[PDB]
Design a protein around this ligand. Sequence first.
Ligand code: HEA
Ligand code: HEA
Ligand SMILES: CCCCCCCCCCCCCCCC(=O)OC[C@H](COP(=O)(O)OCCN)OC(=O)CCCCCCCCCCCCCCC
Ligand SMILES: CCCCCCCCCCCCCCCC(=O)OC[C@H](COP(=O)(O)OCCN)OC(=O)CCCCCCCCCCCCCCC
Ligand SMILES: [Ca+2]
Ligand SMILES: [Cu+2]
Ligand SMILES: [Mg+2]
Lengths: 59, 77, 47, 269, 236, 534, 50
Amino acid sequence: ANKVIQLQKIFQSSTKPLWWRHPRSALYLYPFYAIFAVAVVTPLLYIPNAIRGIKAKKA
Amino acid sequence: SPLHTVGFDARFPQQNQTKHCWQSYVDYHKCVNMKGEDFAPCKVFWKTYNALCPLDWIEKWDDQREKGIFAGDINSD
Amino acid sequence: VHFKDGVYENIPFKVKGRKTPYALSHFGFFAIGFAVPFVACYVQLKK
Amino acid sequence: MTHLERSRHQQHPFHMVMPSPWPIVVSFALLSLALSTALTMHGYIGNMNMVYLALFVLLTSSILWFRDIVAEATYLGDHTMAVRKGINLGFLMFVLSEVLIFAGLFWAYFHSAMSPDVTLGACWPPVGIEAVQPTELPLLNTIILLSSGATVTYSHHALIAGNRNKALSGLLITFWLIVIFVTCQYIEYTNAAFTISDGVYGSVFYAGTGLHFLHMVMLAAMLGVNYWRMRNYHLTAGHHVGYETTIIYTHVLDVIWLFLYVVFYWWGV
Amino acid sequence: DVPTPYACYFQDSATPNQEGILELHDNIMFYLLVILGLVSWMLYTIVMTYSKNPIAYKYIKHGQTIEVIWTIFPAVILLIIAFPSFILLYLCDEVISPAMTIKAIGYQWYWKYEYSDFINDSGETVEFESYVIPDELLEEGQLRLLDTDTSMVVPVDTHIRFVVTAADVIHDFAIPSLGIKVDATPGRLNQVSALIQREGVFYGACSELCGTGHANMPIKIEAVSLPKFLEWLNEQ
Amino acid sequence: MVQRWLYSTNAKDIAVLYFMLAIFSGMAGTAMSLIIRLELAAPGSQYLHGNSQLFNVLVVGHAVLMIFFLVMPALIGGFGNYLLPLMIGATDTAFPRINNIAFWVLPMGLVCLVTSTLVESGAGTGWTVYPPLSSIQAHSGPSVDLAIFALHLTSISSLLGAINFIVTTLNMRTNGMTMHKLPLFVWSIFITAFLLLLSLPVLSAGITMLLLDRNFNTSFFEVSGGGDPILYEHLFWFFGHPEVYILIIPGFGIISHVVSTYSKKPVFGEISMVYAMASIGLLGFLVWSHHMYIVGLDADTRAYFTSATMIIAIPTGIKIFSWLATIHGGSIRLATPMLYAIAFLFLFTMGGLTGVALANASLDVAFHDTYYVVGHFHYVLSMGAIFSLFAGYYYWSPQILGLNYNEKLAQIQFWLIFIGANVIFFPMHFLGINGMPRRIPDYPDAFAGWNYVASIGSFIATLSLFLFIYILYDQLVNGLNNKVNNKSVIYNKAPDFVESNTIFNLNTVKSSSIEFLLTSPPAVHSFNTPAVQS
Amino acid sequence: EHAEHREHLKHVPDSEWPRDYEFMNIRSKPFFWGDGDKTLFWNPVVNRHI
Ligand code: HEA
Ligand code: HEA
Ligand SMILES: CCCCCCCCCCCCCCCC(=O)OC[C@H](COP(=O)(O)OCCN)OC(=O)CCCCCCCCCCCCCCC
Ligand SMILES: CCCCCCCCCCCCCCCC(=O)OC[C@H](COP(=O)(O)OCCN)OC(=O)CCCCCCCCCCCCCCC
Ligand SMILES: [Ca+2]
Ligand SMILES: [Cu+2]
Ligand SMILES: [Mg+2]
């Protein structure tokens, strides 16, 4: 739709980081932070069962 | 006998003999069904694969021949 | 971007303005680096 | 200009990239992927949803990194001639790395074929496995890949010429051509005589062609984001590195498919 | 034959292969010692002379004469030491009419020798596994981690072909007094030839990683005379 | 401090992050080496109660830790990311975020390697991860998979650093610099980045073949299936010898700089040095099968490979003679980098000579998998990489930290590590020539004397390591105090023998490289105006 | 034609599938997806062996 020049003025006049500068940036950035925290907490949490020898119960 | 063996084969001059033992086994099994008239020339390949192949290999290949799983070029014709 | 520059601003840890002594942090870092294999040995000798 | 105005600028072409979280986020997702698949390959996790989640996090983190890099390329104007020369050379080096991965796979195939194992029958393909025929489906695959190469060079030259509608049409056509390639390859995998566990022939065959499969799906994503940027006017007529990168990727993957085709079919049969 | 405490040299040879590689190692160590003496002399006299030099000759930069001299000098040293390496390699790779063949197929932390050319009662092949004697069952005198349950006994003064493969992992068949070291991949057999020149015993170990039972996997070859070997062979 | 260190984008902060992780994992690798050497002091199970699996696990921990987590991050990452921007006058390297993700993918290589050691039995396979010993029939459990992922992540780090380094030293040069006017350390990191780029693909291919064999029932190397375990040997050593030249060529770049600056005269035949580094990097990829002289290659194959492997004694000899030529006729200011450079020259010639005796196909019947090969490689690895590491640290540390180290303490640290490393690795040649096999937690009791003396010398080496980690503390908390008293060496170059002390004070830094003319700790974005050169 | 031949191969009894060789469809471990002895692109019509 040629939003390029408007987006240039928005991205050059903004004291936010370069990944927050678009107006839609919260709409990606909040659920991604939640999904990231889940996905890097969980296999870390599965480590003591791995070194303990307790495999997953097939239920 | 006082110390005889297979000797040197000009078809397999390098260090590994893994196809040499296999080809002697396959040629001993191929002398039986195809030609079958030269029983002592058949035993040349028999002595060769006996001297070169391990017994577990000969047992597995005999089992695969008897169950039809053997991958050798054996045409009963 | 502009960060501060100086004698101790080049390193991630804090050496000068400190509540604990720095020797705690310095030798604790290398001490847990040296004790990681003994913890591995303790696990494998437990099992 | 004067001196007071030249003092408002960079004094060197090169890109001073701002601090950014996507290196540590992509790397944390990479650790979670490695740990989750090593704990799912051995049943310490009950299902594959964790591996699916870690793949999704890695993909969306890489996608956000690419959103930041197209922001720095289009909107902040940081990509000058030296930075464009640099990213072109860097993509050329990464493509050389992928070429060498495939050369390792070719060495695997050539070892298992030139030294035919005695448990296989001393014949290539092994006894009992019937090979995939060259002329039937991979002939269609190689001619649509060669036509994909002709379509990207047509559409790239149409972009340089100033013609908008020829470039977008050519890029859309070659995009649907390479997803027709991915679909024909999946059909070939679906109705095939052997498996990846069917000896070294199935091993190295599906390793080489599945690696080319994954690089073609990567090329599909790249042609998609290139079409989105050309539709929404991000590419200019003289300043474009994503398109040059994607067309040299297409030609490299085309030569890789040519070597894979002629070896694995016109010599493996 | 047997390793010796605080040793610094090869074990005593028993075959033309081992004394060939011993003479080759000393022939190489000659020129390696001349360039070690040269490098260490140059380094020593350079630091002891020029750690107290006040004026550095800072214009000695290119010097093409010594450049081409020290380019063509290691080439002729490698040529000198690569003639006998070629002679010994193509000499020890030949197998010239073996008078015997014994398989040594090495299973997961033991060897199994197989005298398949020969008879036990009449015609049938001879074979035996050679386990290591454990630490608890050692009698006083036996060498720890070297003295096995049964030794591969073999006639002296005759060409033996060793055909070594494996069954589970790569196990190396290594005897350093007999100068043979050939690993055992599960896929392929591997041959070597050796003729033993004196009677005695020759210890060796598995020189390739094998899992947890790697150290306790020795190879005890007993070179005996031909009548006593024939008596042992009919007795087996 | 969350921005500057977590979200980092300049090469200097990433370089010091590389170095902190590198010396941490090097401490861990030295701990595993101490447990190896402590159990290996006497015949019989001494400290590990039996348990040869744990010994093999600690052997792969020490090996893969000290190689892929100490020497490569320290030499390549820390020193390259600090100096490869600076010595060419680059403002900050091209692709800074790839330069950040290479470092940040490293410490989870560390994490998953540590937990590979922790899980069910540990990878007990050697640092070569040869099948079928490493496959699922011998090693069950997820440990070898996590070791394979450690090697994958450090392969990612090395390859991304290689691409970033290549386009930085090609594209981001300053305006006066032709490629023939580049310093030797920059050329060394250049050639090493090319070798990483042309080696890590083959390794990643072979290791994913091994992981696929372990978990997806495919048969690349499984014999029951038709595979060859020699194919993994081919692939791993096609990576593996270019890997050891990757590890050694940054030493060849550091030692040239320190030798020319404490000899007060430039490197003898600098273009010849660039050509000899290039010839070594070209000749590496052609010699990869001297690591498998035993498997039963043809006599023509081994006769080719003994010639090709011996051929590398000519350019390495060219470099080791040009260094003596640079030192010959100078004013040797014997500080700690010059001490480490001299000791590197001597002990690296010794290790390379044992290697050239190892290059023969007929002698490797007597030497393969003995302790002679570990004499060779611990000489060239320990001296040639670690003495280069210590030389580069004691050389560039007070500039890139602004903090001077104590000099007496540094020289007793050098003398301790020199006699300690000699006392450990020199009896290994005797153990190998008498026939002691490798990777064994126990031995016949005839090897016990040389095992005891090397186990003694390991404590001297690790005591010098502990003295180094105290020297770091002293440099960190008394840097300016060591500057102001006479406990340290302030000027690495003296006045010449005509130059007044005042005339020196107006021109105190006489370097042929940009890095020493930067300020103590260099500015966070220096080179505002690009540094010009005739 | 090949789809017609695979439809013809569909109606084959379990004793009529030929000799799966030693190297063919080896199971060093069960897979962790699904239930076990099935690969990713597994066609139960053609690839039947186990
Ligand atoms: C980087 C490579 C490297 C280095 C430096 C070392 C150094 C040492 N290694 Fe080892 N080693 C290997 C890599 C290395 N090793 C490899 C690849 C194997 C093969 C594994 C296999 O075959 O399976 C091996 C195997 C190996 C063996 C043979 C084991 C066997 O086969 O049974 C032994 C036995 O003594 C050993 C012990 C030691 C000891 C006591 C040191 C001592 O020298 C320790 C003293 C070293 C230091 C004190 C280093 C300084 C510390 C730093 C942190 C650097 C500081 C500098 C800066 C930060 C700038 N290691
Ligand atoms: C620091 C890394 C490094 C370097 C630089 C080298 C350098 C060399 N290496 Fe080594 N090597 C290893 C690391 C390295 N190596 C490792 C880690 C292993 C074991 C892997 C494993 O088993 O896990 C190994 C094992 C290894 C083997 C395998 C043996 C076996 O295990 O069966 C061989 C055989 O060819 C070899 C030889 C050489 C040679 C000829 C050089 C040459 O580059 C050296 C050349 C230098 C000189 C020769 C001295 C300088 C020259 C002169 C002074 C001129 C005069 C000299 C002459 C005229 C000869 N080494
Ligand atoms: C372990 C002890 C923690 C003590 C915390 C107590 C807090 C109370 C307040 C005390 C003062 C504030 C403490 C915060 C500061 C701090 O110490 O930095 C903390 C960090 C780790 O932080 P963490 O995540 O573990 O902290 C958890 C809570 N935040 O330490 C370290 O990097 C230790 C590093 C040791 C030194 C490394 C030496 C090597 C550097 C060489 C570089 C040269 C390069 C040259 C070659 C390229
Ligand atoms: C095989 C011999 C070489 C061994 C390996 C080389 C030695 C390694 C260490 C070198 C350290 C010094 C080098 C820098 C000196 C320098 O740079 O010198 C610079 C001078 C400059 O000369 P110019 O002003 O005339 O010309 C200026 C215009 N080019 O060039 C020389 O002096 C040439 C010296 C010739 C040496 C010939 C050696 C003859 C004996 C050969 C061996 C015989 C063995 C007999 C046994 C009984
Ligand atoms: Ca012990
Ligand atoms: Cu090598
Ligand atoms: Mg070996």
